[PDB]
Design a protein around this ligand. Structure first.
Ligand SMILES: [Cl-]
Ligand SMILES: [Cl-]
Ligand SMILES: [Mg+2]
Lengths: 126, 128
Protein backbone atom coordinates (compact mmCIF):
# COMPACT_ATOMS: atom_id res chain seq x y z
CA UNK A 1 0.00 0.00 0.00
CA UNK A 2 1.03 3.68 -0.19
CA UNK A 3 3.23 4.74 2.70
CA UNK A 4 2.08 7.25 5.28
CA UNK A 5 4.15 9.90 3.51
CA UNK A 6 2.56 9.01 0.16
CA UNK A 7 -0.94 9.19 1.65
CA UNK A 8 -0.23 12.72 2.82
CA UNK A 9 0.81 13.70 -0.71
CA UNK A 10 -2.15 12.04 -2.41
CA UNK A 11 -4.71 13.56 -0.07
CA UNK A 12 -3.15 17.02 -0.46
CA UNK A 13 -3.27 16.56 -4.25
CA UNK A 14 -6.97 15.74 -4.07
CA UNK A 15 -7.69 19.05 -2.33
CA UNK A 16 -5.61 20.93 -4.91
CA UNK A 17 -7.71 19.37 -7.67
CA UNK A 18 -10.98 20.25 -5.94
CA UNK A 19 -9.74 23.82 -5.50
CA UNK A 20 -8.94 24.23 -9.22
CA UNK A 21 -12.08 22.32 -10.24
CA UNK A 22 -10.48 19.61 -12.39
CA UNK A 23 -13.26 17.03 -12.38
CA UNK A 24 -11.56 14.64 -14.80
CA UNK A 25 -8.37 14.59 -12.73
CA UNK A 26 -10.38 13.91 -9.55
CA UNK A 27 -12.26 10.98 -11.08
CA UNK A 28 -8.99 9.49 -12.31
CA UNK A 29 -7.80 9.33 -8.68
CA UNK A 30 -10.50 6.76 -7.89
CA UNK A 31 -10.37 2.99 -8.26
CA UNK A 32 -12.90 1.26 -10.55
CA UNK A 33 -14.91 -0.18 -7.67
CA UNK A 34 -14.54 2.85 -5.41
CA UNK A 35 -17.33 4.14 -3.15
CA UNK A 36 -18.09 7.69 -2.03
CA UNK A 37 -20.12 8.48 1.09
CA UNK A 38 -20.58 12.24 1.07
CA UNK A 39 -22.06 13.14 3.49
CA UNK A 40 -21.35 10.09 5.57
CA UNK A 41 -24.73 8.64 6.52
CA UNK A 42 -26.08 8.75 2.96
CA UNK A 43 -26.01 5.75 0.63
CA UNK A 44 -22.68 5.08 -1.09
CA UNK A 45 -22.13 6.21 -4.66
CA UNK A 46 -20.28 3.72 -6.84
CA UNK A 47 -19.22 3.58 -10.44
CA UNK A 48 -16.96 5.98 -12.31
CA UNK A 49 -19.84 7.57 -14.24
CA UNK A 50 -21.72 8.14 -10.98
CA UNK A 51 -18.68 9.55 -9.19
CA UNK A 52 -18.04 11.89 -12.13
CA UNK A 53 -21.66 13.04 -12.04
CA UNK A 54 -21.34 13.70 -8.31
CA UNK A 55 -18.30 15.97 -8.80
CA UNK A 56 -19.94 17.68 -11.79
CA UNK A 57 -22.95 18.53 -9.61
CA UNK A 58 -20.75 19.95 -6.86
CA UNK A 59 -17.91 21.64 -8.79
CA UNK A 60 -19.20 22.27 -12.32
CA UNK A 61 -20.41 25.79 -11.59
CA UNK A 62 -16.96 26.91 -10.64
CA UNK A 63 -16.86 29.22 -7.64
CA UNK A 64 -15.93 26.36 -5.27
CA UNK A 65 -12.68 26.70 -3.37
CA UNK A 66 -11.12 24.32 -0.89
CA UNK A 67 -8.12 24.39 1.40
CA UNK A 68 -6.61 22.25 4.11
CA UNK A 69 -7.04 23.65 7.63
CA UNK A 70 -4.52 21.32 9.22
CA UNK A 71 -2.15 18.45 8.41
CA UNK A 72 -3.13 15.22 6.77
CA UNK A 73 -3.20 12.38 9.31
CA UNK A 74 -1.94 9.16 7.74
CA UNK A 75 -1.82 5.52 8.87
CA UNK A 76 0.53 2.72 7.86
CA UNK A 77 -2.28 0.73 6.22
CA UNK A 78 -2.98 3.05 3.29
CA UNK A 79 -5.53 5.30 4.97
CA UNK A 80 -5.71 8.91 6.03
CA UNK A 81 -7.93 11.69 7.30
CA UNK A 82 -7.78 15.42 6.69
CA UNK A 83 -9.59 18.58 7.83
CA UNK A 84 -10.50 21.21 5.26
CA UNK A 85 -12.83 24.09 4.50
CA UNK A 86 -14.94 24.50 1.36
CA UNK A 87 -16.06 27.93 0.20
CA UNK A 88 -19.22 27.86 -1.89
CA UNK A 89 -22.60 29.53 -2.39
CA UNK A 90 -25.87 28.70 -0.65
CA UNK A 91 -29.17 30.50 -1.18
CA UNK A 92 -27.22 32.87 -3.41
CA UNK A 93 -24.95 33.80 -0.37
CA UNK A 94 -21.28 32.95 0.23
CA UNK A 95 -20.80 30.24 2.79
CA UNK A 96 -18.14 27.98 4.25
CA UNK A 97 -18.37 24.31 5.11
CA UNK A 98 -15.98 22.53 7.45
CA UNK A 99 -15.33 18.92 6.42
CA UNK A 100 -13.20 15.93 7.34
CA UNK A 101 -12.55 13.35 4.64
CA UNK A 102 -11.39 9.85 5.46
CA UNK A 103 -9.81 7.92 2.59
CA UNK A 104 -8.56 4.39 2.00
CA UNK A 105 -6.19 3.80 -0.91
CA UNK A 106 -5.53 0.62 -2.85
CA UNK A 107 -2.20 -0.92 -3.89
CA UNK A 108 -2.18 1.27 -7.02
CA UNK A 109 -2.47 4.48 -5.04
CA UNK A 110 -6.08 4.99 -6.11
CA UNK A 111 -8.91 5.97 -3.79
CA UNK A 112 -10.88 2.87 -2.80
CA UNK A 113 -13.28 4.50 -0.32
CA UNK A 114 -13.96 8.10 0.61
CA UNK A 115 -16.12 9.19 3.56
CA UNK A 116 -16.91 12.87 4.13
CA UNK A 117 -18.02 13.98 7.61
CA UNK A 118 -20.11 17.15 7.72
CA UNK A 119 -23.64 18.35 8.36
CA UNK A 120 -25.49 21.66 8.72
CA UNK A 121 -23.73 22.21 12.07
CA UNK A 122 -20.56 22.70 9.97
CA UNK A 123 -22.10 25.35 7.67
CA UNK A 124 -21.45 29.07 8.10
CA UNK A 125 -23.16 31.80 6.14
CA UNK A 126 -20.96 34.81 5.42
CA UNK B 1 -29.94 10.02 25.81
CA UNK B 2 -30.82 8.21 22.57
CA UNK B 3 -28.79 8.04 19.33
CA UNK B 4 -27.11 11.46 19.40
CA UNK B 5 -28.12 14.22 17.04
CA UNK B 6 -25.40 16.04 15.13
CA UNK B 7 -25.36 18.78 17.77
CA UNK B 8 -25.15 16.21 20.55
CA UNK B 9 -22.24 14.46 18.79
CA UNK B 10 -20.36 17.76 18.77
CA UNK B 11 -20.87 18.13 22.53
CA UNK B 12 -19.94 14.54 23.37
CA UNK B 13 -16.77 14.58 21.32
CA UNK B 14 -15.71 17.92 22.80
CA UNK B 15 -16.28 16.54 26.31
CA UNK B 16 -14.08 13.56 25.42
CA UNK B 17 -11.17 15.91 24.62
CA UNK B 18 -11.64 17.75 27.91
CA UNK B 19 -11.48 14.40 29.75
CA UNK B 20 -8.27 13.46 27.96
CA UNK B 21 -6.83 16.87 28.77
CA UNK B 22 -7.52 16.52 32.49
CA UNK B 23 -6.68 12.81 32.49
CA UNK B 24 -9.86 11.40 34.07
CA UNK B 25 -9.41 7.81 32.94
CA UNK B 26 -12.53 6.46 34.64
CA UNK B 27 -14.73 9.20 33.14
CA UNK B 28 -13.32 8.43 29.66
CA UNK B 29 -14.03 4.72 30.06
CA UNK B 30 -17.61 5.48 31.12
CA UNK B 31 -18.18 7.31 27.81
CA UNK B 32 -17.53 4.07 25.94
CA UNK B 33 -20.06 1.32 25.44
CA UNK B 34 -19.30 -1.70 27.58
CA UNK B 35 -18.26 -3.69 24.47
CA UNK B 36 -16.71 -0.82 22.51
CA UNK B 37 -13.71 -1.15 20.20
CA UNK B 38 -10.78 1.25 19.94
CA UNK B 39 -8.29 1.28 17.04
CA UNK B 40 -5.53 3.68 18.03
CA UNK B 41 -3.60 4.05 15.85
CA UNK B 42 -5.84 2.89 13.08
CA UNK B 43 -4.08 -0.05 11.48
CA UNK B 44 -3.21 -1.76 14.72
CA UNK B 45 -5.33 -4.53 16.20
CA UNK B 46 -8.57 -3.40 17.86
CA UNK B 47 -8.96 -3.16 21.62
CA UNK B 48 -12.22 -4.74 22.89
CA UNK B 49 -14.30 -3.81 25.92
CA UNK B 50 -14.04 -1.44 28.85
CA UNK B 51 -11.39 -3.42 30.78
CA UNK B 52 -8.95 -3.35 27.85
CA UNK B 53 -9.86 0.24 27.02
CA UNK B 54 -9.19 1.31 30.60
CA UNK B 55 -5.79 -0.41 30.49
CA UNK B 56 -5.00 1.39 27.24
CA UNK B 57 -5.84 4.85 28.62
CA UNK B 58 -4.02 4.25 31.90
CA UNK B 59 -0.86 3.40 29.80
CA UNK B 60 -1.25 6.55 27.70
CA UNK B 61 -2.44 9.06 30.31
CA UNK B 62 -1.47 7.64 33.69
CA UNK B 63 1.96 9.24 33.52
CA UNK B 64 0.33 12.66 33.51
CA UNK B 65 1.94 15.44 31.49
CA UNK B 66 -0.56 15.06 28.60
CA UNK B 67 -2.58 18.02 27.29
CA UNK B 68 -5.10 17.87 24.46
CA UNK B 69 -7.11 20.47 22.57
CA UNK B 70 -9.33 20.66 19.54
CA UNK B 71 -7.71 22.39 16.58
CA UNK B 72 -10.95 22.83 14.65
CA UNK B 73 -14.65 22.08 14.89
CA UNK B 74 -16.16 18.67 15.38
CA UNK B 75 -17.71 17.36 12.16
CA UNK B 76 -20.92 15.42 12.83
CA UNK B 77 -23.26 13.22 10.77
CA UNK B 78 -26.96 12.49 11.16
CA UNK B 79 -26.33 8.80 11.96
CA UNK B 80 -24.57 9.22 15.30
CA UNK B 81 -21.00 9.62 14.01
CA UNK B 82 -18.41 12.36 14.03
CA UNK B 83 -14.80 13.23 13.37
CA UNK B 84 -12.57 15.77 15.03
CA UNK B 85 -9.06 17.19 14.67
CA UNK B 86 -6.95 17.76 17.74
CA UNK B 87 -3.41 18.03 19.02
CA UNK B 88 -1.86 16.16 21.94
CA UNK B 89 1.14 17.67 23.74
CA UNK B 90 3.42 15.37 25.70
CA UNK B 91 7.00 15.05 26.91
CA UNK B 92 9.18 12.31 25.46
CA UNK B 93 12.90 11.53 25.45
CA UNK B 94 13.48 14.83 27.24
CA UNK B 95 11.76 16.72 24.45
CA UNK B 96 8.35 18.43 24.39
CA UNK B 97 6.41 16.83 21.55
CA UNK B 98 3.14 17.37 19.72
CA UNK B 99 1.00 14.78 17.93
CA UNK B 100 -1.71 15.77 15.45
CA UNK B 101 -4.64 13.33 15.43
CA UNK B 102 -8.12 12.87 13.97
CA UNK B 103 -10.54 10.65 15.88
CA UNK B 104 -13.61 9.17 14.20
CA UNK B 105 -16.35 7.96 16.56
CA UNK B 106 -19.60 6.07 16.17
CA UNK B 107 -22.11 6.36 19.00
CA UNK B 108 -24.80 3.90 20.04
CA UNK B 109 -28.48 4.45 20.90
CA UNK B 110 -27.55 5.30 24.50
CA UNK B 111 -25.08 8.04 23.62
CA UNK B 112 -22.02 5.91 24.35
CA UNK B 113 -19.01 5.46 22.07
CA UNK B 114 -19.35 2.19 20.20
CA UNK B 115 -16.25 2.47 18.00
CA UNK B 116 -13.30 4.86 17.93
CA UNK B 117 -10.65 5.06 15.20
CA UNK B 118 -7.61 7.31 15.66
CA UNK B 119 -5.72 8.45 12.55
CA UNK B 120 -2.07 9.36 13.13
CA UNK B 121 1.44 8.09 12.62
CA UNK B 122 5.03 9.21 13.13
CA UNK B 123 4.57 11.71 10.26
CA UNK B 124 2.21 13.60 12.60
CA UNK B 125 4.71 13.79 15.48
CA UNK B 126 6.75 16.96 16.00
CA UNK B 127 9.55 17.07 18.59
CA UNK B 128 10.17 20.58 19.96
CL1 LIG C 1 -5.55 20.26 12.57
CL1 LIG D 1 -10.48 22.36 11.06
MG1 LIG E 1 -24.76 -2.14 23.40
Amino acid sequence: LPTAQEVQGLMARYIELVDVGDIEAIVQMYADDATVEDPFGQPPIHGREQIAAFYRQGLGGGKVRACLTGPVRASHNGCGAMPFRVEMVWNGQPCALDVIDVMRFDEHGRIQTMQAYWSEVNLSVR
